[PDB]
Design a binder for this molecule. Structure first.
Ligand SMILES: CC(=O)Nc1cccc2nonc12
Ligand SMILES: [Zn+2]
Ligand SMILES: [Zn+2]
Ligand SMILES: [Zn+2]
Length: 459
Protein backbone atom coordinates (compact mmCIF):
# COMPACT_ATOMS: atom_id res chain seq x y z
CA UNK A 1 0.00 0.00 0.00
CA UNK A 2 2.86 2.50 -0.86
CA UNK A 3 2.39 3.13 -4.67
CA UNK A 4 -0.86 3.69 -6.66
CA UNK A 5 -1.82 0.27 -8.22
CA UNK A 6 -2.19 0.68 -12.01
CA UNK A 7 -5.28 -1.64 -11.55
CA UNK A 8 -7.01 1.18 -9.52
CA UNK A 9 -10.11 2.63 -11.25
CA UNK A 10 -9.94 6.05 -12.90
CA UNK A 11 -13.21 8.04 -13.21
CA UNK A 12 -13.38 9.18 -16.90
CA UNK A 13 -16.38 11.56 -16.72
CA UNK A 14 -13.98 14.58 -16.65
CA UNK A 15 -12.42 13.22 -19.95
CA UNK A 16 -15.49 12.54 -22.09
CA UNK A 17 -15.82 16.00 -23.77
CA UNK A 18 -12.24 16.02 -25.19
CA UNK A 19 -12.55 12.18 -25.54
CA UNK A 20 -16.14 11.30 -26.54
CA UNK A 21 -17.02 7.58 -26.05
CA UNK A 22 -14.44 6.97 -23.33
CA UNK A 23 -15.25 3.75 -21.39
CA UNK A 24 -16.76 4.45 -17.91
CA UNK A 25 -14.75 1.37 -16.71
CA UNK A 26 -11.05 2.44 -16.90
CA UNK A 27 -7.80 1.54 -14.97
CA UNK A 28 -4.54 3.55 -14.77
CA UNK A 29 -3.10 0.60 -16.78
CA UNK A 30 -5.58 1.18 -19.64
CA UNK A 31 -5.34 5.02 -19.35
CA UNK A 32 -1.48 5.02 -19.44
CA UNK A 33 -1.81 2.69 -22.50
CA UNK A 34 -4.37 4.98 -24.18
CA UNK A 35 -1.97 7.95 -23.50
CA UNK A 36 0.58 6.17 -25.79
CA UNK A 37 3.06 4.73 -23.18
CA UNK A 38 3.94 1.06 -22.43
CA UNK A 39 4.84 -0.03 -18.84
CA UNK A 40 6.18 -3.53 -20.05
CA UNK A 41 5.20 -5.23 -16.67
CA UNK A 42 8.36 -3.44 -15.37
CA UNK A 43 9.72 -3.81 -11.77
CA UNK A 44 12.24 -0.88 -12.05
CA UNK A 45 11.07 1.73 -9.44
CA UNK A 46 8.47 3.43 -11.76
CA UNK A 47 5.35 1.27 -11.13
CA UNK A 48 2.85 4.00 -12.24
CA UNK A 49 2.99 7.47 -13.93
CA UNK A 50 0.15 8.44 -11.47
CA UNK A 51 0.65 8.63 -7.67
CA UNK A 52 -1.44 8.77 -4.47
CA UNK A 53 -2.46 11.96 -2.60
CA UNK A 54 -0.06 10.83 0.22
CA UNK A 55 2.84 10.41 -2.28
CA UNK A 56 1.89 13.81 -3.87
CA UNK A 57 1.92 15.47 -0.38
CA UNK A 58 5.46 14.09 0.32
CA UNK A 59 6.53 15.58 -3.10
CA UNK A 60 4.77 19.02 -2.85
CA UNK A 61 8.05 20.81 -3.85
CA UNK A 62 7.78 18.93 -7.20
CA UNK A 63 4.20 20.25 -7.98
CA UNK A 64 3.68 21.96 -11.39
CA UNK A 65 0.04 22.53 -12.30
CA UNK A 66 -0.44 21.67 -15.99
CA UNK A 67 -3.37 22.34 -18.37
CA UNK A 68 -3.84 22.10 -22.16
CA UNK A 69 -6.60 23.90 -24.12
CA UNK A 70 -7.63 23.26 -27.80
CA UNK A 71 -6.63 26.63 -29.41
CA UNK A 72 -8.93 26.09 -32.49
CA UNK A 73 -6.11 17.08 -31.30
CA UNK A 74 -3.75 16.46 -34.33
CA UNK A 75 -5.87 18.89 -36.50
CA UNK A 76 -5.52 22.01 -34.26
CA UNK A 77 -2.94 24.01 -32.25
CA UNK A 78 -2.75 23.35 -28.44
CA UNK A 79 -2.05 25.92 -25.66
CA UNK A 80 0.18 24.36 -22.90
CA UNK A 81 -0.05 26.16 -19.54
CA UNK A 82 2.15 25.59 -16.48
CA UNK A 83 1.72 27.03 -12.94
CA UNK A 84 4.98 28.96 -13.69
CA UNK A 85 2.69 31.38 -15.66
CA UNK A 86 4.13 30.08 -18.97
CA UNK A 87 1.83 29.39 -21.96
CA UNK A 88 3.42 27.60 -25.01
CA UNK A 89 1.52 26.97 -28.28
CA UNK A 90 2.36 23.62 -30.00
CA UNK A 91 1.35 23.10 -33.69
CA UNK A 92 1.35 19.63 -35.29
CA UNK A 93 2.81 21.10 -38.61
CA UNK A 94 0.82 35.51 -17.89
CA UNK A 95 3.61 34.83 -20.55
CA UNK A 96 2.00 34.07 -24.00
CA UNK A 97 4.37 32.52 -26.70
CA UNK A 98 3.55 32.09 -30.47
CA UNK A 99 2.91 28.71 -32.21
CA UNK A 100 5.87 26.31 -32.76
CA UNK A 101 6.33 22.57 -33.48
CA UNK A 102 6.69 19.99 -30.68
CA UNK A 103 10.43 19.35 -31.45
CA UNK A 104 11.22 22.93 -30.20
CA UNK A 105 8.33 23.13 -27.61
CA UNK A 106 9.73 20.00 -25.83
CA UNK A 107 13.17 21.81 -25.38
CA UNK A 108 11.52 24.88 -23.73
CA UNK A 109 9.54 22.48 -21.41
CA UNK A 110 12.78 20.74 -20.18
CA UNK A 111 14.58 24.16 -19.70
CA UNK A 112 11.58 25.65 -17.78
CA UNK A 113 11.03 22.61 -15.48
CA UNK A 114 14.81 22.27 -14.80
CA UNK A 115 15.20 25.96 -13.78
CA UNK A 116 12.01 25.83 -11.64
CA UNK A 117 12.78 22.52 -9.91
CA UNK A 118 16.60 21.90 -9.65
CA UNK A 119 16.76 23.56 -6.15
CA UNK A 120 13.30 22.23 -5.04
CA UNK A 121 13.06 18.52 -5.94
CA UNK A 122 14.45 15.33 -7.59
CA UNK A 123 11.21 15.00 -9.69
CA UNK A 124 8.18 16.74 -11.29
CA UNK A 125 4.50 16.07 -10.28
CA UNK A 126 2.15 17.43 -12.97
CA UNK A 127 -0.99 18.50 -11.02
CA UNK A 128 -4.03 18.09 -13.35
CA UNK A 129 -7.73 18.81 -13.65
CA UNK A 130 -7.76 16.23 -16.44
CA UNK A 131 -10.15 16.78 -19.38
CA UNK A 132 -8.11 14.79 -22.00
CA UNK A 133 -5.88 17.07 -24.16
CA UNK A 134 -3.32 17.37 -21.29
CA UNK A 135 -3.08 13.53 -20.94
CA UNK A 136 -2.90 12.87 -24.71
CA UNK A 137 -0.26 15.66 -25.18
CA UNK A 138 2.24 13.94 -22.85
CA UNK A 139 3.56 11.48 -25.49
CA UNK A 140 4.98 14.54 -27.38
CA UNK A 141 7.38 15.65 -24.55
CA UNK A 142 7.56 12.62 -22.11
CA UNK A 143 9.61 9.37 -22.24
CA UNK A 144 9.29 6.70 -19.49
CA UNK A 145 11.38 3.63 -18.62
CA UNK A 146 13.36 2.25 -15.70
CA UNK A 147 14.56 4.64 -12.99
CA UNK A 148 18.03 5.94 -14.08
CA UNK A 149 20.77 8.23 -12.71
CA UNK A 150 22.20 11.43 -14.19
CA UNK A 151 25.02 10.97 -16.75
CA UNK A 152 27.02 13.68 -14.75
CA UNK A 153 25.93 12.95 -11.07
CA UNK A 154 24.21 10.50 -8.63
CA UNK A 155 20.77 12.27 -8.72
CA UNK A 156 17.88 10.32 -10.32
CA UNK A 157 17.27 11.21 -14.02
CA UNK A 158 14.40 13.64 -14.88
CA UNK A 159 15.36 14.41 -18.54
CA UNK A 160 16.47 12.55 -21.73
CA UNK A 161 18.28 13.81 -24.89
CA UNK A 162 17.52 12.14 -28.28
CA UNK A 163 20.73 13.91 -29.57
CA UNK A 164 23.19 12.24 -27.16
CA UNK A 165 20.99 9.25 -26.10
CA UNK A 166 21.69 10.13 -22.37
CA UNK A 167 19.86 10.99 -19.10
CA UNK A 168 20.31 14.01 -16.77
CA UNK A 169 18.84 15.41 -13.52
CA UNK A 170 17.41 19.03 -13.42
CA UNK A 171 20.94 20.43 -12.71
CA UNK A 172 22.61 18.84 -15.82
CA UNK A 173 19.74 18.95 -18.36
CA UNK A 174 20.86 21.86 -20.63
CA UNK A 175 19.97 21.06 -24.30
CA UNK A 176 17.91 17.88 -23.32
CA UNK A 177 14.55 17.48 -25.19
CA UNK A 178 12.36 15.00 -23.17
CA UNK A 179 10.95 14.89 -19.62
CA UNK A 180 11.84 11.45 -18.20
CA UNK A 181 9.71 9.48 -15.67
CA UNK A 182 7.46 12.41 -14.67
CA UNK A 183 4.70 11.86 -12.05
CA UNK A 184 1.15 13.18 -12.15
CA UNK A 185 -2.10 13.35 -10.13
CA UNK A 186 -5.63 14.18 -11.43
CA UNK A 187 -7.31 16.41 -8.75
CA UNK A 188 -10.73 15.65 -10.35
CA UNK A 189 -10.33 12.01 -9.00
CA UNK A 190 -10.75 13.37 -5.44
CA UNK A 191 -14.57 13.73 -5.59
CA UNK A 192 -15.60 17.28 -6.57
CA UNK A 193 -18.90 18.71 -7.94
CA UNK A 194 -18.76 21.24 -10.78
CA UNK A 195 -15.76 22.69 -12.61
CA UNK A 196 -12.27 23.91 -11.50
CA UNK A 197 -13.09 27.65 -11.24
CA UNK A 198 -16.27 27.00 -9.15
CA UNK A 199 -14.18 24.85 -6.76
CA UNK A 200 -10.99 27.05 -6.68
CA UNK A 201 -13.02 30.27 -6.10
CA UNK A 202 -14.65 28.75 -2.97
CA UNK A 203 -11.21 29.14 -1.29
CA UNK A 204 -9.17 31.79 -3.12
CA UNK A 205 -9.77 35.35 -4.51
CA UNK A 206 -6.09 35.93 -5.58
CA UNK A 207 -6.02 33.85 -8.85
CA UNK A 208 -8.45 35.05 -11.57
CA UNK A 209 -9.40 33.13 -14.74
CA UNK A 210 -8.28 34.94 -17.92
CA UNK A 211 -9.54 31.72 -19.74
CA UNK A 212 -5.91 30.67 -20.61
CA UNK A 213 -4.05 27.43 -19.94
CA UNK A 214 -1.60 28.91 -17.35
CA UNK A 215 -4.56 30.33 -15.27
CA UNK A 216 -6.21 26.85 -14.96
CA UNK A 217 -2.73 25.37 -14.21
CA UNK A 218 -2.32 27.86 -11.30
CA UNK A 219 -5.94 27.28 -10.04
CA UNK A 220 -5.43 23.46 -10.21
CA UNK A 221 -2.25 23.63 -8.03
CA UNK A 222 -3.93 26.24 -5.70
CA UNK A 223 -7.00 23.98 -5.12
CA UNK A 224 -4.64 21.01 -4.55
CA UNK A 225 -2.58 22.99 -1.96
CA UNK A 226 -5.91 24.08 -0.35
CA UNK A 227 -7.01 20.40 -0.02
CA UNK A 228 -3.68 18.93 1.16
CA UNK A 229 -2.22 21.76 3.39
CA UNK A 230 -5.04 24.24 4.44
CA UNK A 231 -8.16 22.11 5.19
CA UNK A 232 -5.92 19.02 5.84
CA UNK A 233 -2.66 19.53 7.89
CA UNK A 234 -0.08 16.77 8.69
CA UNK A 235 2.89 17.78 10.97
CA UNK A 236 4.06 14.09 11.05
CA UNK A 237 5.38 14.45 7.42
CA UNK A 238 9.15 15.27 7.34
CA UNK A 239 10.61 16.92 4.16
CA UNK A 240 14.30 16.71 3.05
CA UNK A 241 16.94 19.48 3.70
CA UNK A 242 17.40 21.41 0.37
CA UNK A 243 18.86 24.73 1.64
CA UNK A 244 19.71 26.65 4.84
CA UNK A 245 16.85 25.07 6.87
CA UNK A 246 19.20 24.26 9.79
CA UNK A 247 20.96 27.69 9.98
CA UNK A 248 17.57 29.54 9.71
CA UNK A 249 16.10 27.40 12.56
CA UNK A 250 19.19 28.04 14.77
CA UNK A 251 19.03 31.77 13.96
CA UNK A 252 15.30 31.79 14.93
CA UNK A 253 16.16 30.22 18.32
CA UNK A 254 19.02 32.77 18.87
CA UNK A 255 17.04 35.92 17.86
CA UNK A 256 14.01 34.84 19.95
CA UNK A 257 16.14 34.40 23.16
CA UNK A 258 17.95 37.75 22.43
CA UNK A 259 14.79 39.82 21.79
CA UNK A 260 12.69 38.46 24.69
CA UNK A 261 15.64 38.57 27.15
CA UNK A 262 16.19 42.26 26.22
CA UNK A 263 12.44 43.17 26.46
CA UNK A 264 12.29 41.66 29.98
CA UNK A 265 15.53 43.52 31.15
CA UNK A 266 14.41 46.83 29.46
CA UNK A 267 10.74 46.94 30.68
CA UNK A 268 10.82 44.36 33.57
CA UNK A 269 7.30 42.93 32.79
CA UNK A 270 6.05 40.82 35.76
CA UNK A 271 4.23 38.33 33.40
CA UNK A 272 4.89 37.06 29.83
CA UNK A 273 1.92 35.45 27.94
CA UNK A 274 3.51 32.95 25.49
CA UNK A 275 0.80 32.35 22.82
CA UNK A 276 1.38 29.66 20.19
CA UNK A 277 2.97 26.25 19.71
CA UNK A 278 1.69 23.89 22.45
CA UNK A 279 5.20 22.26 22.42
CA UNK A 280 6.91 25.67 23.20
CA UNK A 281 9.67 25.97 25.91
CA UNK A 282 10.72 29.13 27.87
CA UNK A 283 13.08 30.86 25.32
CA UNK A 284 14.68 32.85 28.28
CA UNK A 285 14.77 30.21 31.07
CA UNK A 286 16.72 32.35 33.64
CA UNK A 287 14.30 35.37 33.35
CA UNK A 288 12.60 36.52 36.61
CA UNK A 289 9.07 36.81 35.05
CA UNK A 290 5.84 34.76 35.47
CA UNK A 291 5.84 32.62 32.24
CA UNK A 292 2.25 31.61 31.20
CA UNK A 293 1.63 29.44 28.09
CA UNK A 294 -1.43 29.42 25.78
CA UNK A 295 -1.71 26.61 23.14
CA UNK A 296 -2.42 27.50 19.52
CA UNK A 297 -1.45 25.39 16.51
CA UNK A 298 -0.22 27.30 13.45
CA UNK A 299 -3.30 28.81 11.63
CA UNK A 300 -2.96 27.30 8.11
CA UNK A 301 -6.08 29.08 6.68
CA UNK A 302 -7.17 32.49 8.08
CA UNK A 303 -5.12 34.33 10.77
CA UNK A 304 -6.48 33.81 14.30
CA UNK A 305 -8.87 36.58 15.48
CA UNK A 306 -7.37 38.06 18.69
CA UNK A 307 -11.03 38.27 19.99
CA UNK A 308 -11.25 34.41 19.95
CA UNK A 309 -7.71 33.76 21.36
CA UNK A 310 -8.13 36.09 24.41
CA UNK A 311 -11.86 36.69 25.16
CA UNK A 312 -14.54 34.02 25.62
CA UNK A 313 -13.27 34.86 29.17
CA UNK A 314 -5.51 32.12 31.84
CA UNK A 315 -4.00 35.20 33.48
CA UNK A 316 -7.16 36.44 31.59
CA UNK A 317 -5.45 39.92 31.80
CA UNK A 318 -3.28 39.72 28.60
CA UNK A 319 -3.07 43.57 29.09
CA UNK A 320 -0.77 42.83 32.14
CA UNK A 321 2.90 42.34 31.13
CA UNK A 322 3.82 41.31 27.57
CA UNK A 323 2.40 38.92 24.93
CA UNK A 324 4.90 36.83 22.90
CA UNK A 325 3.51 35.73 19.48
CA UNK A 326 6.40 33.68 17.98
CA UNK A 327 4.92 32.66 14.55
CA UNK A 328 1.37 32.81 16.01
CA UNK A 329 -0.33 34.76 13.13
CA UNK A 330 -3.32 36.89 14.39
CA UNK A 331 -5.38 39.60 12.58
CA UNK A 332 -4.20 42.44 14.93
CA UNK A 333 -1.61 42.09 17.75
CA UNK A 334 -2.24 43.92 21.02
CA UNK A 335 0.13 46.91 21.76
CA UNK A 336 1.96 44.93 24.57
CA UNK A 337 3.34 42.27 22.08
CA UNK A 338 6.72 40.86 20.92
CA UNK A 339 6.01 39.29 17.44
CA UNK A 340 7.80 37.13 14.80
CA UNK A 341 5.53 36.91 11.69
CA UNK A 342 6.51 35.10 8.44
CA UNK A 343 6.24 37.31 5.30
CA UNK A 344 4.47 35.05 2.76
CA UNK A 345 5.67 37.32 -0.15
CA UNK A 346 9.36 36.25 0.31
CA UNK A 347 11.03 34.51 -2.69
CA UNK A 348 12.99 31.41 -1.44
CA UNK A 349 13.41 27.67 -2.23
CA UNK A 350 11.67 27.00 1.14
CA UNK A 351 8.57 29.18 0.40
CA UNK A 352 6.16 27.82 -2.29
CA UNK A 353 3.17 29.77 -3.65
CA UNK A 354 -0.03 29.04 -1.71
CA UNK A 355 -3.81 29.59 -1.47
CA UNK A 356 -5.55 33.02 -1.26
CA UNK A 357 -2.27 35.04 -0.99
CA UNK A 358 -0.81 32.65 1.65
CA UNK A 359 2.35 30.60 1.03
CA UNK A 360 3.53 27.03 1.71
CA UNK A 361 6.71 27.33 3.85
CA UNK A 362 8.44 23.92 3.76
CA UNK A 363 11.28 23.59 6.36
CA UNK A 364 11.35 20.09 7.97
CA UNK A 365 7.45 20.36 8.07
CA UNK A 366 5.03 22.10 5.62
CA UNK A 367 3.21 25.18 7.08
CA UNK A 368 0.60 26.81 4.82
CA UNK A 369 0.81 30.44 6.11
CA UNK A 370 -1.93 33.08 5.72
CA UNK A 371 -1.19 36.15 3.52
CA UNK A 372 1.09 38.71 5.22
CA UNK A 373 -1.02 41.72 6.35
CA UNK A 374 0.72 45.05 7.37
CA UNK A 375 -2.48 46.19 9.23
CA UNK A 376 -1.86 43.40 11.81
CA UNK A 377 1.08 45.45 13.22
CA UNK A 378 -0.72 48.87 13.66
CA UNK A 379 -0.20 48.85 17.51
CA UNK A 380 3.52 47.90 17.10
CA UNK A 381 6.75 49.08 15.36
CA UNK A 382 9.45 47.15 13.46
CA UNK A 383 12.07 45.78 15.94
CA UNK A 384 15.44 47.40 15.09
CA UNK A 385 18.58 45.15 14.93
CA UNK A 386 20.63 45.11 18.17
CA UNK A 387 22.96 42.69 20.01
CA UNK A 388 22.91 42.52 23.84
CA UNK A 389 25.26 40.51 26.10
CA UNK A 390 25.87 40.62 29.88
CA UNK A 391 28.42 37.76 29.41
CA UNK A 392 31.95 38.51 30.74
CA UNK A 393 34.50 40.02 28.27
CA UNK A 394 36.91 37.03 27.94
CA UNK A 395 38.26 35.51 24.66
CA UNK A 396 38.95 31.76 25.31
CA UNK A 397 40.29 29.29 22.67
CA UNK A 398 38.69 33.53 13.88
CA UNK A 399 40.95 36.59 12.96
CA UNK A 400 39.97 40.17 14.09
CA UNK A 401 39.30 43.77 13.01
CA UNK A 402 38.25 45.97 16.00
CA UNK A 403 34.40 46.26 15.89
CA UNK A 404 32.75 49.70 16.11
CA UNK A 405 28.91 49.59 16.42
CA UNK A 406 26.22 51.69 18.18
CA UNK A 407 24.08 48.43 18.41
CA UNK A 408 26.70 46.28 20.27
CA UNK A 409 25.19 46.63 23.76
CA UNK A 410 27.93 45.32 26.10
CA UNK A 411 29.98 46.49 29.17
CA UNK A 412 33.01 46.78 26.80
CA UNK A 413 31.14 49.11 24.36
CA UNK A 414 29.84 51.12 27.37
CA UNK A 415 33.55 51.40 28.37
CA UNK A 416 34.34 52.80 24.83
CA UNK A 417 36.16 49.68 23.32
CA UNK A 418 34.42 46.35 22.26
CA UNK A 419 36.40 43.24 23.54
CA UNK A 420 37.30 40.51 20.95
CA UNK A 421 34.79 37.95 22.42
CA UNK A 422 31.78 40.37 22.16
CA UNK A 423 32.93 41.29 18.60
CA UNK A 424 32.94 37.59 17.44
CA UNK A 425 29.53 37.08 19.12
CA UNK A 426 28.24 40.36 17.63
CA UNK A 427 29.21 39.36 14.08
CA UNK A 428 27.83 35.79 14.50
CA UNK A 429 24.48 37.12 15.86
CA UNK A 430 24.28 39.66 13.02
CA UNK A 431 24.81 36.81 10.49
CA UNK A 432 22.08 34.62 12.11
CA UNK A 433 19.79 37.71 12.21
CA UNK A 434 20.35 38.50 8.48
CA UNK A 435 19.70 34.79 7.63
CA UNK A 436 16.30 34.76 9.37
CA UNK A 437 15.24 38.11 7.85
CA UNK A 438 16.16 37.12 4.29
CA UNK A 439 14.36 33.74 4.96
CA UNK A 440 11.26 36.05 5.25
CA UNK A 441 10.64 36.45 9.03
CA UNK A 442 9.74 39.98 10.28
CA UNK A 443 10.04 41.23 13.92
CA UNK A 444 7.66 43.77 15.57
CA UNK A 445 7.60 45.10 19.18
CA UNK A 446 5.61 47.40 21.51
CA UNK A 447 6.26 51.11 20.69
CA UNK A 448 7.86 51.89 24.15
CA UNK A 449 10.71 49.41 23.46
CA UNK A 450 14.05 51.31 23.56
CA UNK A 451 17.54 49.67 23.59
CA UNK A 452 18.72 52.74 25.60
CA UNK A 453 17.10 51.10 28.68
CA UNK A 454 19.57 48.15 28.38
CA UNK A 455 22.79 50.15 29.19
CA UNK A 456 21.84 50.46 32.96
CA UNK A 457 21.71 46.59 33.30
CA UNK A 458 25.50 47.11 33.65
CA UNK A 459 26.64 49.59 36.42
C1 LIG B 1 8.90 26.50 13.13
C2 LIG B 1 8.40 26.91 11.76
O1 LIG B 1 9.04 26.64 10.71
N1 LIG B 1 7.21 27.57 11.79
C3 LIG B 1 6.68 28.50 10.87
C4 LIG B 1 7.40 28.98 9.79
C5 LIG B 1 6.83 29.89 8.88
C6 LIG B 1 5.54 30.34 9.00
C7 LIG B 1 4.78 29.86 10.09
N2 LIG B 1 3.54 30.15 10.44
O2 LIG B 1 3.33 29.37 11.57
N3 LIG B 1 4.45 28.62 11.92
C8 LIG B 1 5.34 28.94 11.01
ZN1 LIG C 1 23.10 15.48 -12.63
ZN1 LIG D 1 -5.91 30.28 -5.95
ZN1 LIG E 1 33.11 42.61 25.99
Amino acid sequence: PTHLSVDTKFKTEGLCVDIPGIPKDMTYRRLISMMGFKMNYQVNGYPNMFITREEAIRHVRAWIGFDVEGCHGTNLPLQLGFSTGVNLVAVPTPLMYKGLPWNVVRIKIVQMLSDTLKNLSDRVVFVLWAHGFELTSMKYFVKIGPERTCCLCDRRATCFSTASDTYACWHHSIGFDYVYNPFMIDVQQWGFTGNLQSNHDLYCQVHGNAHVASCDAIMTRCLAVHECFVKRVDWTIEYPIIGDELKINAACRKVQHMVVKAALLADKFPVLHDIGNPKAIKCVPQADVEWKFYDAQPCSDKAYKIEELFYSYHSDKFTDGVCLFWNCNVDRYPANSIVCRFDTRVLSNLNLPGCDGGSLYVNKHAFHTPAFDKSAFVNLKQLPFFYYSDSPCESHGIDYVPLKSATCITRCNLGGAVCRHHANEYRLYLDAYNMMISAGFSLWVYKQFDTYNLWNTFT
